[PDB]
From a paper:
The ongoing evolution and immune escape of SARS-CoV-2, alongside the potential threat of SARS-CoV-1 and other sarbecoviruses, underscore the urgent need for effective strategies against their infection and transmission. This study highlights the discovery of nanobodies from immunized alpacas, which demonstrate exceptionally broad and potent neutralizing capabilities against the recently emerged and more divergent SARS-CoV-2 Omicron subvariants including JD.1.1, JN.1, KP.3, KP.3.1.1, as well as SARS-CoV-1 and coronaviruses from bats and pangolins utilizing receptor ACE2. Among these, Tnb04-1 emerges as the most broad and potent, binding to a conserved hydrophobic pocket in the spike’s receptor-binding domain, distinct from the ACE2 binding site. This interaction disrupts the formation of a proteinase K-resistant core, crucial for viral-cell fusion. The common theme emerging from these studies is that the receptor-binding domain (RBD) of the viral spike serves as the primary target for neutralizing antibodies (nAb), succeeded by the N-terminal domain (NTD), the fusion peptide, and the interface between the NTD and subdomain 1 (SD1).
To investigate the structural basis of Tnb04-1-mediated broad and potent neutralization, we determined the crystal structure of Tnb04-1 complexed with SARS-CoV-2 wildtype RBD at 2.3 Å resolution. Tnb04-1 epitope covers 683.6 Å2 surface area, involving 17 residues largely located in the N-terminal core structure of RBD. The Tnb04-1 paratope consists of 13 residues, with a major contribution from seven residues in CDR3, complemented by three residues each from CDR1 and CDR2. At the binding interface, Tnb04-1 forms seven hydrogen bonds with the RBD, mediated by Tnb04-1 residues S29, D54, G100, G101, and Y104, and RBD residues T333, D364, F338, G339, and N343. Particularly, CDR3 residues F102 and F103 penetrate into a hydrophobic pocket, comprised of residues L335, F338, F342, Y365, V367, and L368, and form multiple hydrophobic interactions through their benzyl groups on the side chain. We then superimposed ACE2, control antibodies LY-CoV1404, S309, and Tnb03 (3-2A2-4) onto the SARS-CoV-2 RBD-Tnb04-1 complex. This reveals that Tnb04-1 binds outside the ACE2-binding region without causing steric hindrance, indicating a neutralization mechanism independent of direct ACE2 competition. Compared to Tnb03 (3-2A2-4), Tnb04-1 approaches its epitope with a 21.2° shift towards the outer face of RBD, which led to gain two conserved epitope residues (P337 and E340) on the outer face of RBD while excluding two relatively variable residues (S371 and F374) on the inner face. Regardless, Tnb04-1 epitope residues are highly conserved, reaching 96.60% among SARS-CoV-2 and 88.03% among sarbecoviruses among over 16 million RBD sequences submitted to GISAID. Tnb04-1 was able to engage all RBD conformations, suggesting an indirect modulation of the interaction between RBD and the ACE2 receptor.
Residue numbers in the entry:
A (entry chain L): 1 to 214
B (entry chain H): 2 to 131, 136 to 217
C (entry chain E): 333 to 527
D (entry chain B): 1 to 116
Write the structure that this text describes.
């Protein structure tokens, strides 16, 4: 079948700059079926382009489409603030199919995270579970590595992460990483440490605490 | 001109639901019509197509389980969904398809949540702050079902520096999130900080004071 | 006494658009079907209710020879029990079809460098065609409840679309000429025969 | 599969005679029909004479009583004996082979000119 791959996964640019988004098909395909869509957070998709190069009625003049064969392109000539969003391409065999989407985000300068670690509360320990929380606050770009070390052993497979949307004021991200343990496991160990790697840091930053020491 | 989906909600694995899409300004029975869904933080996935003339097509992930149909007298499109699975959890949109002219009209969607969990109010635990710089503190809002949860700080007085994170679904089937704020560390001496947590599906309202 | 005129169909300079598909009625004549099937040349040659290598031993009351151009993707739809834009809205075979479907890649006659926009298909139609129905209506398709009054616009679409046949198209998007032979045997007399 | 070689044309005076030959080679079904056609300048192609499957010759009206068409099966060649030629017989003449009822083949085209 037709498989659409979009590039890049994330595009980082500034208002007034030129965005170029690529959609590659797994196979030569008719340009007559290639459509582009915009999606803003919480909103339904909006058709921008149909037939690879025709604008939908109402779509501003700066949106432009092109390409042929397997390689198609969406071009936003001069980015307005409302153009920052997700974009999908779409093709058609016997049925519609969608590319995985390109995120268009606001470029800003590098900003290292502030890193904080939170031990589990006594209330939680009472109920038999321990959650340890590591916070990376207001950083850019989005890429960051969070490693949990317990008694200096790298911990895999018992953490989950959540990330905010780009901050409306300073354009950064923040990230929450939660390590989950039983009360009994948590009390088997002494040193709980969160190690953060980020382009804005000259070397990795570790925040830690010792269980039971103020 | 509108498409309005409804009928989505909670359902248990193996169960079944019927979605409805009420059109205004297009005639359902005269169009190519699609259901397109979108899982949390995922892309768009086409699911089902019905031709004007009645032919139907299905994504492989739903063949044998979903059935697209319509009711001409009610100008309404349906998606019958049987043998529902956790990975079917998504916002489900209907859209009119012009094929060579793309999908021009989309509905806002209806949410389907496939889960065997029981409705449960959250536990709210403090994230305690630990000196001329910046401190962080917050509340961990743990083990609730279903979504949503709302968090405010100091009854809405404190908004600057607040980050309320998207929930994660845990392996237990219950959701969990954190809400944090950064303040001047000297403010811990002269300020009190309380998160206000609302989980209306369980009628839970909790205020939790956070201190060192 | 007469030689069958299938050559008008297979050697025609230009073929019909599928929505306006041609039909030639063959009667009172003889033909040698081995000339047809021993020429290689065909990307598709599938028969239903008859065997090709048997055809020279048969007589039929009439034979219909339908012909048109569709995209290589779509030749699969020229078969009993199919669905799709072609089978539903342009050319439909009945479930009890007795005949042969014959197709061959025509990229080098029917495609042109900047696109051959002369071959059309029907994209919009309210209901499916009956078997062997031919709809050549060019009325504006009304997709809502407001009349179109012969004006294209929102909810008002020209019902036919052009193939864009360019020689660089992928093989599935390249034009294929199709000939559908139907073997009609009512009663007497069977006057279309092999040698 | 089928090649057709034409000969016998050129310029003659009114009243003169020509013989056209169409030599048919290749893979030819026992069921075939050969004929001679012509295309006057700025007009449409018209049948002149042909041998039906019965072996029976058939003539256009304007040439009946003047032209004789025969088929020498041994050389699989088709002969158009043209007597009593007239200026209105001027045209490019083509022979046609209808093979098995499914395909046909044309010759390159032979100029005949009747003028004084
Ligand atoms: C009528 O169609 C036949 C069948 O496709 C044509 O015959 C082919 O012609 C090409 C080029 O001359 C040959 O390479 C093939 O081998 C021929 N096939 C057969 C079975 O004869 C024929 O030339 C066409 N007649 C026209 C266009 O006048």
């Amino acid at each position: 079948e037709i498989v659409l791959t979009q590039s890049p996964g994330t595009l980082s640019l500034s208002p007034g700059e030129r965005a170029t988004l690529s959609c590659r098909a797994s196979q030569s395909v008719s340009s007559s079926y290639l459509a582009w869509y915009q999606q803003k957070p919480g909103q339904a998709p909006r058709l921008l382009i149909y037939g690879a190069s025709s604008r939908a009625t109402g779509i501003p003049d700066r949106f432009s489409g092109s390409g042929s064969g397997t390689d198609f392109t969406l071009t936003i000539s001069r980015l307005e603030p409302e153009d920052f969003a997700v974009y999908y391409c779409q093709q058609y065999g016997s049925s519609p199919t969608f590319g995985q989407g390109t995120k268009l985000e606001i470029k800003r300068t590098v900003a290292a995270p502030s890193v904080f670690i939170f031990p589990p509360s006594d209330e939680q320990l009472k109920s038999g579970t321990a959650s340890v929380v590591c916070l990376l606050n207001n950083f850019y770009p989005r890429e960051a590595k969070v490693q949990w070390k317990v008694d200096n052993a790298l911990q895999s497979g018992n953490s989950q992460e959540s990330v905010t949307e780009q901050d409306s004021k300073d354009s950064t991200y923040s990230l929450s990483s939660t390590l989950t343990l039983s009360k009994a496991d948590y009390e088997k160990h002494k040193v709980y440490a969160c190690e953060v790697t980020h382009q804005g840091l000259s070397s990795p930053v570790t925040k830690s605490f010792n269980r039971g020491e103020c | 001109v509108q498409l309005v989906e409804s009928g989505g909600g909670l359902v248990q694995p193996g169960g079944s639901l019927r979605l409805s899409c009420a059109a205004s300004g297009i005639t359902v029975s005269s169009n190519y019509m699609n259901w397109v869904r979108q899982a949390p933080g995922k892309g768009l996935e086409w699911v089902s197509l019905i031709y004007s003339g009645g032919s139907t097509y299905y994504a492989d992930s739903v063949k044998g389980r979903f059935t697209i149909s319509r009711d001409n007298s009610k100008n309404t499109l349906y998606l019958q969904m049987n043998s529902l699975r956790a990975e079917d959890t998504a916002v489900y949109h209907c859209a009119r398809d012009l094929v060579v002219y793309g999908m021009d009209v989309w509905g806002q969607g209806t949410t389907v949540t496939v889960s065997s969990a029981s409705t449960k109010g959250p536990s709210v635990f403090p994230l305690a702050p630990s000196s001329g710089g910046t401190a962080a503190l917050g509340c961990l809002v743990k083990d609730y079902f279903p979504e949503p949860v709302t968090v405010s700080w100091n009854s809405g007085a404190l908004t600057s520096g607040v980050h309320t994170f998207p929930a994660v679904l845990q392996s237990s089937g219950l959701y969990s999130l954190s809400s944090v704020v950064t303040v001047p560390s000297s403010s811990l001496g002269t300020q009190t900080y309380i998160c206000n947590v609302n989980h209306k599906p369980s009628n839970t309202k909790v205020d939790k004071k956070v201190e060192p | 006494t007469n030689l069958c005129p299938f050559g008008e169909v297979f050697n025609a300079t230009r073929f019909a658009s599928v929505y306006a598909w041609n039909r030639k009625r063959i009667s009172n004549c003889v033909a040698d079907y081995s000339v047809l099937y021993n020429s290689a040349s065909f990307s598709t040659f599938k028969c239903y209710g008859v065997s090709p290598t048997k055809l020279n031993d048969l007589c039929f009351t009439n034979v219909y020879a339908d012909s048109f151009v569709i995209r290589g993707d779509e030749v699969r739809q020229i078969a009993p029990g199919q669905t799709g834009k072609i089978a539903d809205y342009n050319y439909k075979l009945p479930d009890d079809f007795t005949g042969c479907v014959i197709a061959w890649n025509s990229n080098n006659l029917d495609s042109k460098v900047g696109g051959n926009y002369n071959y059309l298909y029907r994209l919009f139609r309210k209901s499916n065609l009956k078997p062997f129905e031919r709809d050549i209506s060019t009325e504006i398709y009304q997709a809502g409840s407001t009349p179109c009054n012969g004006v294209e616009g929102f909810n008002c679409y020209f019902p036919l679309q052009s193939y864009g046949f360019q020689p660089t198209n992928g093989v599935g998007y390249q034009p294929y000429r199709v000939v559908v032979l139907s073997f009609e045997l009512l009663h007497a007399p069977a006057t279309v025969c092999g040698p | 599969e089928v090649q057709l070689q034409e000969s016998g044309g050129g310029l003659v005076q009114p009243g003169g005679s020509l013989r056209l030959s169409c030599a048919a080679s290749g893979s030819i079904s026992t069921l075939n029909v050969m004929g001679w056609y012509r295309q006057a300048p700025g007009k449409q192609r018209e049948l002149v004479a042909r041998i039906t499957l019965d072996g029976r010759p058939e003539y256009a009206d304007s040439v009946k009583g003047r032209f004789t068409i025969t088929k020498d099966g041994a050389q699989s060649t088709l002969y158009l004996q043209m007597n009593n030629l007239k200026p209105e017989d001027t045209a490019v003449y083509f022979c046609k082979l209808e093979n098995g009822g499914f395909f046909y083949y044309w010759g390159q085209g032979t100029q005949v000119t009747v003028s004084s």
